[PDB]
Amino acid sequence: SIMSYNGGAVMAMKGKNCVAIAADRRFGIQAQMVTTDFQKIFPMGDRLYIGLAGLATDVQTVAQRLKFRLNLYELKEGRQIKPYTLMSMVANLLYEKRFGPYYTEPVIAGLDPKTFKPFICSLDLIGCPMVTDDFVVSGTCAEQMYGMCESLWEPNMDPDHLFETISQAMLNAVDRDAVSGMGVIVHIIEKDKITTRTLKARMD
Amino acid sequence: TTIMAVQFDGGVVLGADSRTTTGSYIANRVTDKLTPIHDRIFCCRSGSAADTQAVADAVTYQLGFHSIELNEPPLVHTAASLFKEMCYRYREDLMAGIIIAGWDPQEGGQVYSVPMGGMMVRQSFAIGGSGSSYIYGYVDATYREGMTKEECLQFTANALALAMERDGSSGGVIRLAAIAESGVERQVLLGDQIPKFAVATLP
Amino acid sequence: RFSPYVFNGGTILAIAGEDFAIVASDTRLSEGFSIHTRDSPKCYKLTDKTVIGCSGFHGDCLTLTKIIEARLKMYKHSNNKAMTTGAIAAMLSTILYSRRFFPYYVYNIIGGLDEEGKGAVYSFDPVGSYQRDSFKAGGSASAMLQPLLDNQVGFKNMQNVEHVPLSLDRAMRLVKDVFISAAERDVYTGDALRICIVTKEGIREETVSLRKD
Amino acid sequence: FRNQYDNDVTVWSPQGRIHQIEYAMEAVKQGSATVGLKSKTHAVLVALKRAQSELAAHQKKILHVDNHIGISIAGLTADARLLCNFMRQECLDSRFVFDRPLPVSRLVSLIGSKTQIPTQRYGRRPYGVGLLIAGYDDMGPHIFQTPSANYFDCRAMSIGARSQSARTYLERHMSEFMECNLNELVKHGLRALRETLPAEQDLTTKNVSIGIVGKDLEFTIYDDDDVSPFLEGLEER
Amino acid sequence: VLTNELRLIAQRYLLQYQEPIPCEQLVTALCDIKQAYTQFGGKRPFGVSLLYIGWDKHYGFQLYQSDPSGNYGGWKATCIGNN
Amino acid sequence: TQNPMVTGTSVLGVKFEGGVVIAADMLGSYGSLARFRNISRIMRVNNSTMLGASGDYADFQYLKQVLGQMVIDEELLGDGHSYSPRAIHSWLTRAMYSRRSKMNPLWNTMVIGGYADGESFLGYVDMLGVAYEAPSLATGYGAYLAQPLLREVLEKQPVLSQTEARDLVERCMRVLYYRDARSYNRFQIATVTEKGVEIEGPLSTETNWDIAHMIS
Amino acid sequence: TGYDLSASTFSPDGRVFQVEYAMKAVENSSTAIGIRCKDGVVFGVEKLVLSKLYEEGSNKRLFNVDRHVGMAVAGLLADARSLADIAREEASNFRSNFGYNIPLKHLADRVAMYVHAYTLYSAVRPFGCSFMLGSYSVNDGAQLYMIDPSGVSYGYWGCAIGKARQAAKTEIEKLQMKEMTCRDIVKEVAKIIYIVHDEVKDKAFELELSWVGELTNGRHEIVPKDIREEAEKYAKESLK
Amino acid sequence: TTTLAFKFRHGVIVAADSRATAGAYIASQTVKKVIEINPYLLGTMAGGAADCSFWERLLARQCRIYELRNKERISVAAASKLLANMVYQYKGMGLSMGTMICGWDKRGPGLYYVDSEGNRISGATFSVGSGSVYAYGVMDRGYSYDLEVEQAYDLARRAIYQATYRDAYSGGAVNLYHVREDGWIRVSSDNVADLHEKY
Amino acid sequence: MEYLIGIQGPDYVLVASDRVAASNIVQMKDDHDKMFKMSEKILLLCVGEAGDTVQFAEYIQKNVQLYKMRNGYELSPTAAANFTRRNLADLRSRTPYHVNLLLAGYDEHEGPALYYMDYLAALAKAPFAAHGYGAFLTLSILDRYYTPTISRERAVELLRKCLEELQKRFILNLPTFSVRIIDKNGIHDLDNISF
Amino acid sequence: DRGVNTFSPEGRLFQVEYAIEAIKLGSTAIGIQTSEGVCLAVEKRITSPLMEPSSIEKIVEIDAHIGCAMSGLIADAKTLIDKARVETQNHWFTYNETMTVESVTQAVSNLALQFGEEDADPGAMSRPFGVALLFGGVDEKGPQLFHMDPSGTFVQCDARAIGSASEGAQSSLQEVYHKSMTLKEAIKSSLIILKQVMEEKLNATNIELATVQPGQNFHMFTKEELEEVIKDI
């Protein structure tokens, strides 16, 4: 598979007045690991991150063009972007290459800068917006992640249990995927702060 | 898919089945297969389902504006030449064999077979669709020079009912149309009104 | 999608002499297993000092000469003289190359005199490379004529032979003998033989029949 | 006036005229004159050659167009060379497509179509040239005359400066031309051009050019040595 | 219009090199655009002066002044407009 | 066009002393079906050129349109020139080859016959641009079944009278009806002479099936 | 005046002067008349030959624009050949698209729109020529349409264009064109051309005549030589 | 087809055979497989003939334009790079070329390998062709920078001889050119069958 | 197949490349330089499909030199590496460049920088990197002995262990190896390691 | 204002006449045809001793067999001489022979009246080239001299003067010329007439001269070779 050439594994999970987003750190070519500190989650605001799994060169291409369009939007507009507008901008940008598609399935996890409602969504690789109320997962270990997140997610959790659930849901899923893993970063987006953590994970 | 048009003195009689299949599942069993291009000019749609509507919208567009400019009811040969030009110009991307039938005051009842290719030929009767192979031999044997209106309606209903009996990709109701100077009289033959031919049972 | 070439057969033959050039061709035109016509000459007079030979696909053989005569008359307008043999060859090399990625399936053999009154044979590929030779066979039956001319003109594999220059009376009989040898063994060559001899007086023709089968 | 109606070809003057078109005919009414005429078998052009300085040789006033057509110039020379390359291209496209040379009567209508288009569009100028076109085809020999985009079929015709006397001489002697041979035909045109000269100048081997086309003779320009038998001749002025 | 153009220039640079643009490149780019309309095209020229402040890692805090002719200069204090 | 659908089979032609006669059946096949039985595959271009085409029939009607509009736009000038059949043959060679060069051919194999300046013209053009003249022409299965009879008669006697050439054409069309699967016993004959172009038809051939009693 | 250097500029009283100056340029040129009758259309043109050096057939003012349609022109003739080629291309495109010969009403209203398209812009000039179109078919009858350079087109029983238009129009009005055969119409046409002729100014002229009708089965043809010459003879003896 | 060229102390020696083939059929034995660019430069023929000939003729036109405009002859490093920029655009359309550019510039000798695959390298020795692998073995065992001129002629002719002896697809005539500082000069033109008698 | 290796230290980057140019069974150049000087503080190591490599490298090189001409100062290695990544990424076009790249650079403010890049133009900054099939044999030794505080003599020793692994185990004949080092004093050429 | 394509009442384009007026300000050129070849001489007109005289070039190589003189606005002769060189090299590329001088002069004079402001392939010419030229060369017809002007009207010459001092130098070239004149004598009389018309004082520093022969190529004279004929004065 062309999506599975680099591996990749990003998920989000919705809490009580806070969201969590985590991404795998392996940058790979089909069998060969190259580095273990690859960036997949990008800051698009104070309380809004986008995470892109899949082909890593399409991750960096879409993140550069998205930052190009978003900086123009925020300079011309004079405000921070609301996450639904970012979802429609990303879906527009991916659908402009409909028959030439970028090989990335971005997830978006952040907080509304005015109302602070939690927002989680993902997309396909061609631009279908899928707003869910529990979690979205993306990458080559999709089945491994849905198996964890259907059972460990519970509604209305504090940031501690949100961290614990997204941590276990990442770790036991990526320990069953060969071409993904090698370290994981966890971002906890809250009302007053952003918490950036890395976890103990298998390195094989 | 079985369409048929028969020229008689004073107009034409059209006929069509009503079964549109995708694979072997009937997607629509009340399909209307007679499209009015002008008041008294009908085209019939066999082959690719998209093309025979998409070209027909362009031909209706050209022919209505042409008729308004010329202050004349448009000819059937004009409506056939606008298909002969355009279905030829895109024949690699169209799969369209059209049977145009209609009436005009200048030359009477007219049936033009435009086969898949973008040519044009006037015939006394024209059959088309996937089912027409099973009723070539009927209409070569039954057609007489100069049938009346009701004899043509019974001839079109019999020839369609044979193809609907034999071809699995055809069936439903028989939608007829008789186009003449007085206007268009359409009628639908359903159930018992479809002409019935008993099976070749063992004695 | 439209297999766009048909090998329409034929062989052409050119020999550069001391003060002449002989160009010969069959006139049978073929298409697989059929004979289209028995009088279709392949020698096309360009100017007074150059006759060209054609072999290969016949549609390109017609189209290319309708290009070349136009280019000759453009030259005769813009330069106020007829083209030399080397000028025609250098022109046709560019013309054949400009159709690089859809080539004229034509093997051109230009025969004629240069400006010094010697024979020059210029034999080309479809993609425009060219070279000067003393003699050349082309087209379908080239492998039956070219070793015999290698024996008789270049005098290879012969010991105790005087390398006499190319006289006309021996060369004409050589052309007739090699075409009888081609017509006996190749199916594509036959039905006539049209011979153009380029000398300083002008261009003349001689016709000999071949095998009809 | 004079001044706001002579600046554009696309302005009708209130008499129903276009002053930029009529000024373009002054470019043909100033040029070195030329004489054309035909028989039932031949068509011949006679032209003065303008050599600019006595060490400068003579301006070509007859141009090769094909084997079967030659033209003459009077006026803006580079416009006539543009139109020569046009006619070269048209005869070559007719030979390339239909494998017979284009008939002259259609080719001059194509020239009349080409010169017409700048006479109507803003920012353009009319071609400042008049031509005499000598050709031979299936319909026999032809002499044509083309600035204002008109074109004329002519038995014998002379354009250029002071050309009225040459037109009167050709009106006097056009009744002979059909049955004259090739030799007498050019002699009449040499006298017709000799009408146009000032009294002291004579027709020499250097300042008279001749083009000749016939039933089996391809078109050829007759210059310095080739003009000498046709010059001799000659009834003196 | 010109400050809509300036943002496109600076974001094309930040797109292409993934670092923010040096302060003089933006000013010379806009003076190239303002110079182009004074020479050809037959339009009217823009009638605006623009004072330019900005920081970069190469020379730190800077100042510029531009005109409709396409000139620019570095300044430590300057003034445009009335008086 | 990549797919010929409505096709026409063999077209014959032979020069005779004073003109050219060509012939063709009146069938448009659709695969194996005899779908159209009363189409004409012979075009009268002007008073001295006729044209018959085998192969795809839609491209023949496109050439009827273009080559009719050419001779009408010639006759609008009214200068006394008419296209000699060699000019129409060269034009068709260039049009068929120019369609070939775009990888978009006109799937035909055409025979131009004419009579101008007292000289008969008979010229062949196929979908590639292979073009030549011959004393007799035959496209399709006529090239194997009717061409040998034409050249066998022409070897003994190179000059044919009009009725001899007409019966030779009829006797070749009988052969094609006996031995071509896509032919039809309803054919046209078009003859150009000094007086101009006539088309006679529909004609029919009379069969002989006495070998059907020669099984046992 | 300042208001007449451009066709894209109205004058303060509401006139477009480049068009009204082109309609003065039309009535500089020689007389051309056309008479529609019961079964066909006959055209007649006073063809001046400015010098007898000129061959016959030069400066024809009768054009064929389709095989069933003819055309007679007046004015600056170099524009008229361009409009003849526009009408030829328009009738050719109509035959190619719609499969039959173009109705003359629609052809006149295509060519009238092409003429009108130049009376709007400063980047072109209006045509300096008026022209007529005549046709015949079994389905449509005979028809005669006349266009002036303003683009305005109407259908006519009889028309005269050129420098002698009014004296010819009053003379065409004297005739009963509606009920005569065309072989009886050529003699009037030839009568009126020699009547309105200016013989003291711009001498040495020729008559040019053509008809389309049932007697040519709708094909537009020139008048034969003996019929044209006996029309010339009848008109010269009527002229005294 | 086998071509080789090598730099040494007194310039560049270029040697080539003369056999062009059409499958198993041999079409010619007199192919000039060193193409004469100008009075100071040589190009070589391997793979496709017309593909070599057109681009090297157009390069000769290009460097003559450069001599007219910049008033100085072209260097090897510029001219071979222009050949690379011409042939780089048409990768993958079916071109076949193997070339060596040999001249004398201000860096001294010049010898660069450019092909239709896009490779552009320097080197002291090269060999290109179908039977080039046999030419490398005979060439490199005698090669050094301190070769004498006539011994370099003998080494070049011997390497082309053994390359023609082993390759079925190579043969013809051993053509030998020598580029020096004052221009290129023809050394000899020798049949293979005579050198079999000599060796 | 061509070989690349680069090691990023505390205030230096050490890169090395094989010095072989091959043609399908034989090598045609044994002094082949795959290191192209971009500017005073930056090298781009270039391997991959032939022709694409040199054209792409020189096209980047003249734009880096052109930026220096327009501005009077050098690109940062981050900016030049993202520029090279953008030009290689603009892949799905009619001009794909199948090139494999390492870029080594030194900045005044950020220090030594090493960038890995494949033919997809995936840009990954790494403390050490290597291309070719020979990378599969020596990234294990680089994982064994590399520490972030390796001084340059241990770097040349570990590089010598890596090239001896190429000599002992790797099947392609890679006998001679060119090495350069970049630091705050510009570019430095070191002695060739031969076997 | 009015267009660049406006006819005067005399039938002359105004711009075509005014470019001929810009001819009459240029450095005067002298070219003479002989049977042993053609010699061409143009005055450099050095304006300052700070100027390098060698970098002024008013006689150019066109190919190995064709020279060319110029007078007037030398910046127009930049694009004219470069299109002439491209045409000669295209003729060598296509036909593998030398281009004759007449076809070269026809090709260059086509670029004259390829000007105008409405057809306008993107940024082509808006005014006539105000340079008149003398083409001297040798071909298969032998040594020849051609003359060209801003009207695009080209013609053959035996000797010609162009420019500011064209008038009297044309009559003096009428005086000296005979068809049996040698090349060295033509160099001699060309420097005679140029020294008659130069305001400055003639030496090897303020003229250029070159010759083309059937035997040898186009050869621009060096300073010592100029000095050698200049000693004869």
Curated annotation (Swiss-Prot), chain D:
List of residues that carry Phosphoserine: 109, 175
Predominant cellular place of this UniProt entry's protein: cytoplasm
Transmembrane segments: none
One BP annotation, GO: immune system process
Compartment(s) where it occurs, according to its Swiss-Prot or TrEMBL record: Cytoplasm; Nucleus
GO molecular function, one term: lipopolysaccharide binding
Sequence position, cross-link Glycyl lysine isopeptide (Lys-Gly) (interchain with G-Cter in ubiquitin): 114, 206
One GO CC annotation: cytoplasm
CDD domains found in the cross-reference section: proteasome_alpha_type_1 (cd03749)
Glycosylation positions in this chain: 109
Keywords: Acetylation, Cytoplasm, Glycoprotein, Immunity, Isopeptide bond, Nucleus, Phosphoprotein, Proteasome, Ubl conjugation
Inducers of expression: Induced in breast cancer tissue (at protein level). Up-regulated in liver tumor tissues.
Function text: Component of the 20S core proteasome complex involved in the proteolytic degradation of most intracellular proteins. This complex plays numerous essential roles within the cell by associating with different regulatory particles. Associated with two 19S regulatory particles, forms the 26S proteasome and thus participates in the ATP-dependent degradation of ubiquitinated proteins.
Assembly with partners or alone: The 26S proteasome consists of a 20S proteasome core and two 19S regulatory subunits. The 20S proteasome core is a barrel-shaped complex made of 28 subunits that are arranged in four stacked rings. The two outer rings are each formed by seven alpha subunits, and the two inner rings are formed by seven beta subunits. The proteolytic activity is exerted by three beta-subunits PSMB5, PSMB6 and PSMB7. Interacts with NOTCH3. Interacts with ZFAND1.
Family (UniProt): Belongs to the peptidase T1A family.
Entry-linked PANTHER family: PROTEASOME SUBUNIT ALPHA/BETA
From Swiss-Prot, chain E:
Positions bearing N6-acetyllysine: 43
Protein's cellular compartments: Cytoplasm; Nucleus
Induction line: Down-regulated by antioxidants BO-653 and probucol.
A GO CC term assigned to this protein in UniProt: proteasome core complex, alpha-subunit complex
Residues in coiled coil: none
Family under the similarity heading: Belongs to the peptidase T1A family.
Annotated protein name in UniProt: Proteasome subunit alpha type-4
Shown residues in whole-protein numbering: 85 to 167 of 261
UniProtKB/Swiss-Prot annotation, chain F:
Cellular component GO terms, alphabetical: ciliary basal body; cytoplasm; cytosol; extracellular exosome; mitochondrion; nucleoplasm; nucleus; proteasome complex
GO biological process annotation, one example: proteasome-mediated ubiquitin-dependent protein catabolic process
Subcellular location, record wording: Cytoplasm; Nucleus
One Gene Ontology molecular-function label: lipopolysaccharide binding
Modification Phosphotyrosine occurs at: 57
UniProt key word Cytoplasm: yes
Keywords: Acetylation, Cytoplasm, Disease variant, Host-virus interaction, Nucleus, Phosphoprotein, Proteasome
Keyword tRNA-binding recorded: no
Induction field: Up-regulated in fibrolamellar carcinomas.
Assembly mode: The 26S proteasome consists of a 20S proteasome core and two 19S regulatory subunits. The 20S proteasome core is a barrel-shaped complex made of 28 subunits that are arranged in four stacked rings. The two outer rings are each formed by seven alpha subunits, and the two inner rings are formed by seven beta subunits. The proteolytic activity is exerted by three beta-subunits PSMB5, PSMB6 and PSMB7. Forms a ternary complex with SMAD1 and OAZ1 before PSMB4 is incorporated into the 20S proteasome. Interacts with PRPF19. (Microbial infection) Interacts with HTLV-1 Tax protein.
Record family assignment: Belongs to the peptidase T1B family.
Protein name, entry field: Proteasome subunit beta type-4
Gene: PSMB4
Curated annotation (Swiss-Prot), chain I:
Entry-linked SUPFAM superfamilies: N-terminal nucleophile aminohydrolases (Ntn hydrolases) (SSF56235)
Localization terms from the record: Cytoplasm; Nucleus
Residues recorded as bearing N-acetylmethionine in the entry: 1
Biological processes per GO annotation: proteasome-mediated ubiquitin-dependent protein catabolic process
Source organism, top-level taxon: Eukaryota
A Pfam family it matches: Proteasome
Keywords: Acetylation, Cytoplasm, Host-virus interaction, Nucleus, Proteasome
Induction of its expression: Up-regulated in ovarian cancer cell lines.
Keyword match Acetylation: yes
PROSITE patterns per the UniProt record, alphabetical: PROTEASOME_BETA_1 (PS00854), PROTEASOME_BETA_2 (PS51476)
Family listed: Belongs to the peptidase T1B family.
Assembly and interaction partners: The 26S proteasome consists of a 20S proteasome core and two 19S regulatory subunits. The 20S proteasome core is a barrel-shaped complex made of 28 subunits that are arranged in four stacked rings. The two outer rings are each formed by seven alpha subunits, and the two inner rings are formed by seven beta subunits. The proteolytic activity is exerted by three beta-subunits PSMB5, PSMB6 and PSMB7. (Microbial infection) Interacts with HIV-1 protein Tat.
PANTHER family: METALLOPROTEASE TLDD, PROTEASOME SUBUNIT BETA TYPE-1
The protein's name in its UniProt record: Proteasome subunit beta type-2
Lineage: Eukaryota, Metazoa, Chordata, Craniata, Vertebrata
